[PDB]
Design a protein around this ligand. Structure first.
Ligand SMILES: [Ca+2]
Ligand SMILES: [Ca+2]
Ligand SMILES: [Ca+2]
Ligand SMILES: [Ca+2]
Ligand SMILES: [Ca+2]
Ligand SMILES: [Ca+2]
Ligand SMILES: [Ca+2]
Ligand SMILES: [Ca+2]
Ligand SMILES: [Ca+2]
Ligand SMILES: [Ca+2]
Ligand code: NA
Ligand code: NA
Ligand code: NA
Ligand code: NA
Ligand code: NA
Ligand code: NA
Ligand code: NA
Ligand code: NA
Ligand code: NA
Ligand code: NA
Lengths: 135, 134, 134, 134, 134, 135, 134, 135, 134, 135
């Protein structure tokens, strides 16, 4: 909050991009075991996506897509944040979500959009990821 | 304003200690760890999931977990050690029950993921969850 | 900022209405009573007993009471009418049950003091609890 | 947001009622006077002298004053009727004492300026102080 | 702190007016209704459904609804009449499109539940949503 | 809720001048029984004296002094407000308090100073008085 | 906060009076209107347009408008009549100018839309804008 | 910052017990010279007393009593805090303050009560003491 | 936080840099210095004097100072790089002037104490002022 | 608010006394060049005086006077703070300000009154001085 100087402060939390390529579950547990009170980031405001988007475009090593903490654990278009927050904001890319081949149930940030809009993607895909934390 | 090995939550800092201690022996450890600490208190439906998940990830152990709830008068009058109000409950199946009329301290049950509570014999030994102001 | 025939609670204002209406009819009655009204939403363990006592003291009859929770998708996707977050639950025992796949609207149960919820058939004509900004 | 005939104190409204009534009558009178009303609960040192003058000046009559503190278990475990915490005591000398046997309700003592408390017979008729939320 | 025929939201008061007026008339009507009023501005993602449901319930008739957003410079430089920041957008599919370079005022689209926007001829006669400060 | 329109709003309390001439101990009781939560006025900040001064000069109908709620109930220079507020501000006139002839234990605003400065006075003197209320 | 015919702005109420008066008498009228009123003061870059528009809408007839800024020392020390700090300026081009003709009071320039300031003779009858605390 | 680690944070202030035995005036000056903005502690709420009590009982090495920043320098029951705070709260033990033999004008916390209640005491005695600091 | 070598003002931390850079190069420097950094934005009349004194006492050289205001689409539409609104202006005499239609980036004028603004060539190597969020 | 330990926290700012002797001109500049966002101290509340008065008395290594950031630049009783704050508070000493021999235009705190009250004195006089900083 109280954020480290290599983290992005925003609306009470601290956000950071991780360039390692991990599957969605791998990345979630990475954040949670990084420090108490960490998850894959949640978004809740129209004005948070641009600030996140620009931050990734400036500190992202590579071009890998970026996981965030939205999941469809019931495979029925009921999307949930892993920080147990409330799905009160959506920023989907065109024609998404689409459950392509019924393989996609996790959510990434699309590089083509500036990491601004969301896409549902195959869980086991190995991407970069964005942790959020309380400090 | 917590140390980076603690859980921030609603202005206080929480932490799981893996050593085994009796309820009283656990409360005293927290109190003497640093000025202004106690066995943790819970006051919101939302704090119960948050704690359960923190423990399930950082509990370098196996056992159940003490919290600072005690039936002092032994008549279902549950006080917190930190002297805060008892305005929230999260019991397990058919708890509290005073099994053998020797159970008066409260623990977090691992079979529930550490979300529900059970009254247990105070002199038994578990891990515990401290609660500190920093 | 709320009239005296209503209960003030956490910035919003509630009132039990005794005329029986089906779930849909009740929601719309609140909506058109005044701009910014819905069937009530509940978000804290502390809000439940305060609503339960208000109903008991001001409710005429022993009928059940509608609240703004329903499953529009008919698959356990519980959504409040006022679009607030489903961040709290107080289900009765063995609920929700989707009994005979006719129950999709949630009521407060009378013989629990109105602390616990039950999903019920939408056409059932109950009392209802409005929630309004002012 | 208090009306003019009430005392505004710390976010609640307080008013004395001079009609003589037993304790359970006083509590239910407030309850049904308006939604969100009970007998007064006192929580701060600074609140006792403020209620003290208010009653001293607007108590048209001469009686003791019920407040919403009672030993519902009859074993010196006192609870407020608004479900609030018991985080403050302001007893008189030699109180509480369960004198004789049935002194389980709490009254404000006129010989203290209505500042200190005495436990008294449930069924005794007194003036009473409602607190409400407007 | 709103009247009852008005919708309270995030510190301001909103109301739908069903008389059909061109954009500049609708702005001037709000302005003269009471000091400190303008055609509504919208600043949060959650504000849109709130307005969308209000209008649907209270829109006597069937029209598009003016809001206080216009492109005075006729070059995609949209400004709110209340001088607030243009920190939020909620366009309909393909809009804004400056059709035939004659569309510079913003309306709410009934075919989206009044959630999404379209740029429209300013002289078109629409219902309108005033926004006042009390 | 707010103050009534014939009252001065200042820092959460309401103040009104009353031109009736009363003894200090009658002034206090008039205020206390005007409405629950009323006492003779209490002043706590440097900037409060000008606001109270100007207000009186405009809505005062007379040339009398004005009682305020400061009292030496002990008769030994222990000045206390009737509202139980903190004696954390002083604005004494020249050579005050004086305990003139061991009879001056109640405090009045001095019209000769614009009603900005205080004077300890005989309590039985009949002056105007300033109430202070919570609404 | 305010009455329904006043402009609420940043915790105060503003209102224009179309009667013509000399500066001194305008100030006197505001002060004896209601306790806690003066000629208006301006402190933020963003307030001047908010006032400029309010007047342009509710000013009947035409003239210039007084505000509560003057110079009693007769140099260039401008003091508000509400004793607030002179921490914001907004003069018209080449103003102030002491056009030694009794020019020591400030008015709003209709040629700017009532946004920028000008020093003009005190005795000149102009309209005025009061600033009240409700 | 907002309280070191061996200090007790409470209601926006920091507190610490010093077991070095000192006189009441000596203890005051010790605090004031420890850091800018320090005094012998001040108590203001019914709930503050037991939090202090529990803290002292746990962290007080030694057995003596404990000074707090309340004294009667007018020697007439005019009790005032050294930090200029308002005497808006009392917590005396039974039969105190008793000005025993007109020697007692400084205040201490009483062991018999768990350091919860107060006692007026000879200002020259040697007790431990409780500092209070803004950080 | 705000390091002791930065200027605290209204929740953000500002620091002068004396290394001479083109405007884009100055912006990309800030953005890459620390997450949450851009060229400075200014929003209050009172912010301009405080920035001015800071630069006059801490900058080295006599270069004009860049800020993050830019006419990106080159039509007198000035936007901040940190995405805050353009609600404040402090232009210099007869500025902006798009001189020779080659000036689209905004600098501070040393000849005004670094208080007023001027549009300038985008690659004019100047000192710059970063605005960060710690 | 984030004051280091050698500074006085008060009402959101940090203050410190410097015993080095410097003129008013020089003292104001040393503060401003110490850290970004510094000036000679400003005072705005009745209660700020005794809190400053006591801090200086405890930490002043000298017998000298103390500069504050108040001066009459126009030279006509238009007292203006150097931090550009409002002159909303006065604490003038006895028979001050007095422009003694039309030479005194800057303001100091006098040791006579425990550094509580103000005197206008000579700009070029070399006194101790008090800085005020945002941290
Ligand atoms: Ca997809
Ligand atoms: Ca058990
Ligand atoms: Ca059911
Ligand atoms: Ca008794
Ligand atoms: Ca269009
Ligand atoms: Ca006298
Ligand atoms: Ca002129
Ligand atoms: Ca004693
Ligand atoms: Ca230029
Ligand atoms: Ca002098
Ligand atoms: Na988030
Ligand atoms: Na807790
Ligand atoms: Na609700
Ligand atoms: Na209460
Ligand atoms: Na709006
Ligand atoms: Na007061
Ligand atoms: Na103003
Ligand atoms: Na204290
Ligand atoms: Na800024
Ligand atoms: Na200051």
């Amino acid at each position: 909050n109280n954020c480290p100087q290599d983290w992005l402060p925003m609306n009470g939390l601290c956000y950071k991009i991780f360039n390692e390529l991990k599957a969605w579950k791998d990345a979630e547990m990475f954040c949670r075991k990084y420090k108490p009170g960490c998850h894959l980031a949640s978004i809740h405001l129209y004005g948070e996506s641009p600030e996140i988007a620009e931050y990734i475009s400036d500190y992202h090593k590579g071009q890998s897509e970026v996981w965030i903490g939205l999941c469809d654990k019931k495979k029925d278009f009921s999307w949930e944040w892993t920080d147990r927050s409330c799905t009160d904001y959506l920023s989907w890319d065109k024609n998404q979500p689409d459950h392509y081949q019924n393989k996609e149930f996790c959510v990434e940030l699309v590089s083509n959009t500036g990491y601004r809009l969301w896409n549902d993607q195959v869980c086991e895909s190995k991407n970069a990821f964005l942790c959020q934390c309380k400090f």
